[PDB]
């Protein structure tokens, strides 16, 4: 029963037809097309069996419509469960004009319903060059989560040599999965990382672990060195929708050099510590109670052992008030600071000292531990109008210490003719008056209406002086001056120092508002006027300690530096942020910064980042003195950061970043590389140089120059992920 023309009849089309014998084979010839839901086979010949049964197209091609999938086979059979099979089959997601990559297997089975394709005697070819063999492979047809290998990552660096990571993904269930990361490192060994992700109706979190038997001996004989390298931790968040909220951020590592050796993904600066925290939080409408157990583990040998807060219990809040009424607030804290000092002495072969442990430079009261309780009620009367406000506030601060000091601290104390009071109290009140005025003005720029505001404010601050030198410092820092300094009731964070203040802060801020309430720009200027000296200081910045070590600033002046600060947004395109702090009493620049960020909304692929940072007024603790310190000539920040990402050709992309430190005249980081994208495959290659954190065997901070090349090819359609890190953090706007 021959047929011709546009023969049509699962649907078996074709230009020609012929049909054949009953119960026997039913053949078909000429431009044959088998079709089905999302399926298509084309070829020269066809053979059917029964009404519902076998099909077999010879010299065939095929196309899976919903995926981008095509291939060819010497022949193709369709069976009962619609499982089509190919012989000498091909599979690819490249366009019909490309041979970018193809999978060629002896048998290739496709199940479009399951979305599962398999191949036996499979080769992966790159531009028809065979690059990888396997006796078996399976791949996904549709883009559902399924377990398997994930796209690998090649690299080569100074710390690891050649590196290969071929992750394996365990798709255990819709709401929890896991991934294995075998890292082969030419220079260290086989490291095995692992992650477990989970999701519940109450909780969400991720487990992480990693092991590696290091073959690198560069750090043999360094303090606290370890041949076995490892890491485990948990992040978890429970009860975001509840008034109870438990939260874990815990990590533990094997040796201090873990991240200095096994990681080049945090970028410059590395990290000196990891967190170990668990927090329970009750969240009521007018008050919050918080149980926080929190400690740090050092990933470094040249920093001092941190305190920990075994139990930190806090209860803050305020009482229901009437509108415009008075307002009562209250904040209460019990904390337990402990710490086990690693002050061991590392000798040479003989008795000569080769290094000093930092904790050994801690003397006297800098070695205390104990309990601190802190109670801080306050009252305030907000008096507001549409155009201004005045809010007076009366606070009372009461802190109690139950200290404990070891033997060496006591001997260090009476060596300085001082005694140790293990029980100390401090009581002092605080008076604060905040006032301001609201001015408005309609304007028009480029034919768009702005509302410009003018907001000037004053805050009088009074806190009596109380010698606090007999107290340790557990949780206190002294922030650098900034415009936000003008409105804080303590020049110190934490509770170990309460600043003596009789001062006035004057400031104004202008804002630019669009019609929808959005804010294009902000400019602010202010200064503080001091009616008394500033006597309360951090240990080693008080007058007694200054002339105990013989130095000498911002102690006795009658005004703060000037504080300027400003932000501007240009349409939805670029953005600029700047701040500047100038000291009139010395005619020098305290700190400053200009940060430009360009990234249009017509094309987020163009990204430019220009940044300058200067800072010379940081107060940091000093490992070798055992005390705090202000002028640190070698820690001055005078740095630029430039980074770019640009599309040279619509499918190519260049990217680079330079980060330069003038204070020492050296590049901190510099890298460049390209990132080409195509229908079926992308490729990213990055040459990189950077200064990595290093603690040498003498307990002295150093840095080493590291170079690296980073390579990732990805064959779209052959597995992958749907959702590098230094490339992410170091270039503002690597988000597409």
């Amino acid at each position: 029963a021959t047929l011709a023309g546009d023969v049509v009849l699962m649907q078996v089309e074709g230009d020609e037809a012929n049909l054949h014998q009953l119960e026997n084979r039913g053949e078909l010839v000429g431009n044959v097309k088998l079709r089905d839901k999302g399926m298509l086979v084309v070829g020269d010949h066809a053979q059917v069996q029964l009404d519902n049964g076998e099909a077999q197209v010879d010299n065939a091609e095929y196309v899976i419509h919903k995926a981008h999938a095509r291939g060819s086979a010497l022949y193709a059979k369709r069976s009962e469960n619609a499982i089509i099979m190919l012989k000498d089959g091909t599979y690819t997601r490249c366009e019909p004009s490309s041979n970018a990559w193809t999978l060629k297997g002896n048998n290739v089975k496709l199940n479009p319903a399951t979305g599962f394709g398999t191949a036996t005697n499979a080769t992966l070819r790159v531009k028809d060059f065979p690059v990888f063999y396997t006796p078996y492979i399976y791949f996904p047809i549709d883009d559902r989560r399924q377990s398997g290998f994930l796209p690998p990552s090649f690299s080569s660096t100074s710390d690891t040599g050649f590196t290969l990571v071929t992750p394996y993904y365990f798709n255990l269930a819709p709401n929890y999965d896991a991934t294995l990361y075998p890292r082969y490192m030419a220079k260290r060994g086989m490291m095995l990382e692992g992650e477990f992700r989970y999701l519940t109706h109450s909780s969400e979190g991720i487990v992480n672990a990693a092991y590696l038997n290091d073959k690198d001996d560069h750090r043999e004989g360094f303090p606290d060195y370890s041949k076995d390298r490892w890491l485990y931790g948990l992040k978890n968040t429970t009860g975001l929708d509840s008034r109870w909220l438990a939260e874990v951020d815990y990590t533990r590592i094997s040796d201090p050099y873990y991240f200095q050796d096994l990681d080049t993904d945090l970028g410059v600066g590395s990290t000196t510590y990891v967190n170990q925290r668990g927090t329970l939080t009750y969240r009521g409408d007018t008050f919050t109670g918080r149980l926080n157990a929190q400690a740090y583990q050092l990933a470094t040998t040249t920093d001092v052992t941190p305190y920990d807060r075994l139990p930190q219990i806090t209860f803050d809040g305020f009482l229901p008030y009437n509108p415009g009424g008075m307002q009562f607030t209250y904040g209460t804290e019990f904390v337990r600071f402990d710490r086990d000092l690693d002050e061991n002495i590392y000798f040479n072969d003989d008795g000569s000292i080769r290094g000093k442990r930092p904790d050994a430079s801690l003397q006297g009261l800098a070695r205390a531990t104990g309990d601190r309780m802190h109670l801080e009620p306050g009252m305030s009367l907000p008096m507001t109008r549409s155009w201004g406000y005045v809010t007076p506030t009366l606070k009372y601060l009461y802190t109690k210490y139950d200290l404990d000091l070891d033997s060496q601290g006591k001997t260090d104390l009476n060596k300085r003719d001082e005694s140790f009071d293990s029980n100390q109290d401090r009581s002092l009140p605080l008076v604060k008056v905040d006032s301001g005025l609201y001015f408005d003005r309609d304007t028009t720029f480029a034919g768009t209406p702005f509302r410009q505001t003018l907001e000037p404010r004053a805050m009088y601050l009074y806190v009596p002086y109380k010698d606090q030198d007999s107290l340790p410092v557990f949780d206190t820092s002294e922030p650098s001056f900034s415009y936000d300094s003008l409105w804080r009731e303590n020049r110190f964070t934490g509770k170990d120092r309460i600043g003596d203040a009789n001062q006035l802060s004057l400031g104004v801020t202008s804002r630019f508002i669009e019609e929808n309430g959005f804010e294009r720009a902000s400019i602010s200027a202010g200064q503080i006027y001091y009616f008394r000296d500033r006597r309360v200081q951090l240990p080693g910045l008080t007058e007694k300690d200054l002339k105990r070590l013989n130095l000498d600033l911002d102690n006795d002046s009658w005004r703060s530096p000037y504080a300027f600060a400003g932000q501007y947004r240009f349409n939805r395109d670029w953005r600029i942020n700047s701040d500047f702090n100038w000291n009139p009493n010395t005619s020098r620049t305290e700190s400053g910064s200009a940060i430009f960020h360009y990234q249009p909304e017509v094309d987020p692929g163009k990204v430019v980042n220009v940044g300058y940072r200067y800072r010379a007024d940081a107060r940091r603790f000093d490992s070798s003195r055992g005390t705090f310190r202000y002028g640190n000539e070698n820690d001055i920040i005078k740095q630029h950061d430039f980074s770019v990402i640009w599309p040279l050709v619509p499918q190519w992309s260049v990217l680079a970043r330079w980060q330069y430190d003038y204070n020492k005249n050296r590049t901190l980081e510099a890298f460049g590389g390209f990132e080409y994208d195509s229908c079926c495959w992308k490729l990213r290659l990055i040459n990189r140089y950077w200064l990595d954190v290093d603690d040498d065997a003498f307990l002295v901070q150093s840095e080493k120059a590291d170079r690296g090349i980073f390579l990732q090819i990805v064959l779209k359609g052959l597995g992958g992920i749907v959702g590098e890190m230094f490339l992410d953090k170091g270039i503002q706007g690597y988000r597409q």
Partner: peptide, 12 residues
């Protein structure tokens, strides 16, 4: 293999 975001199982 193909890794993606977590999500809750359909219930029916």
């Amino acid at each position: 293999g193909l890794k993606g975001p977590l999500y809750f199982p359909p219930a029916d």
